[PDB]
Symmetry: C3
Subunit: 145 residues, 3 copies
Amino acid sequence: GSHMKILVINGPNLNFLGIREKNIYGNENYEYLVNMINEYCKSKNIEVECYQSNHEGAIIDKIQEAYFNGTDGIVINPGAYTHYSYAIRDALASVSHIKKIEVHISNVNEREEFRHISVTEPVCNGQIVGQGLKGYIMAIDMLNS
Amino acid sequence: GSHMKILVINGPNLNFLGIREKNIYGNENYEYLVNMINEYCKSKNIEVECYQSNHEGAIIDKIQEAYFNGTDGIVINPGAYTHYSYAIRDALASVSHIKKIEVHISNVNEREEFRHISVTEPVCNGQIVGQGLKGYIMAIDMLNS
Amino acid sequence: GSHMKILVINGPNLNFLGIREKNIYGNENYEYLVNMINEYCKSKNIEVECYQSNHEGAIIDKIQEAYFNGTDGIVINPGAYTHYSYAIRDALASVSHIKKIEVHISNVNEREEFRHISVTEPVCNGQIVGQGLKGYIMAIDMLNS
Ligand SMILES: O=C(O)C1=CC(=O)[C@@H](O)[C@H](O)C1
Ligand SMILES: O=C(O)C1=CC(=O)[C@@H](O)[C@H](O)C1
Ligand SMILES: O=C(O)C1=CC(=O)[C@@H](O)[C@H](O)C1
């Protein structure tokens, strides 16, 4: 369209930023994250929607909807689904014309062993990890490149 | 009843047949598949319902509903849930009087390593793989045997 | 509050107690279990809610709601999600002020290999297994200690 259209998907538990495990995920809350993204996109003339769900199937539904509605790019933090949801992987693979960047707040490489592997990353166009909430902004920049 | 009653369940991403990964899943779309099944069942005097969902829990709900509504057989392509959904496995095991056939469009034996194992198949009465959309018809035939 | 508030969460397939695999899960049905819990809690002046869902995301939603509504303790039988749902694990970890006890009806240690490991248990305050429906009562007692 006339402006780039990005969808930011946050997966399960991400609406509990600021409540959950503060030493790992930071002190700022989910509303803070959404506001940060919205204000950054406004400043870049990027249309953005921030979506969050705890449901694997709803995430997939939202990726499918992005196919039909002119979405150019997806920034996705699948939450714990990163480590096991082959269904979200297949959904991301099904939208071949949408650029996708995976984001993790924490340095997943240095946490529990099960967090070291992402089953979604192989079908994404990029990734970021371990940069805190700024990783979302870095992902937007990757898409707006 | 007076006629065999079959439920066909398609799991996540299967509504994107014809859009997704065409070299793997074929050129025909989900509506084509549903029509094919409906016309074949009509010709055999089989009552059929085709259902699709991206939600693991909705699949389980639909299997449970089949217990109460006189369903004789289930044809199920769990999609990527095949490889990890012990919850769908348990659901299929919970309906001991319903015959179940698992279907895969693609030859999962010759794809990525994670696609080689099915956690749902051990509780099904049969399976088909690698026959394209015709596998659904072959599954119906297995049930109508 | 004036009385302890407990939430009992049953995961997928548990509403099919008494129908499913009777040699493993027992002859009594889910309504029997709910009644048993309700009558025991009434006798102890404990406020209880019994919730069941087949949906992973709904379970997570319900754990999150417990954060806001003054829930003191959760008894959770995740069903098959025990073996793979890192998303439910993270949800349980996100509610650091709610005591959590994991329950399994069957002796999961002596069943199929995939049932031997729980990804949810490491973030719970306790567990019970292999005691039949009485395990739920034992879990309530653990919380009311
Ligand atoms: O944002 C992140 O780093 C992550 C979020 C989740 O919620 C985790 O399950 C994941 O392992 C790491
Ligand atoms: O129909 C199939 O062959 C399959 C469908 C899915 O959607 C896949 O995740 C699965 O590994 C194979
Ligand atoms: O209550 C239990 O013992 C269990 C319930 C489930 O429904 C199972 O998938 C799990 O492995 C054991």
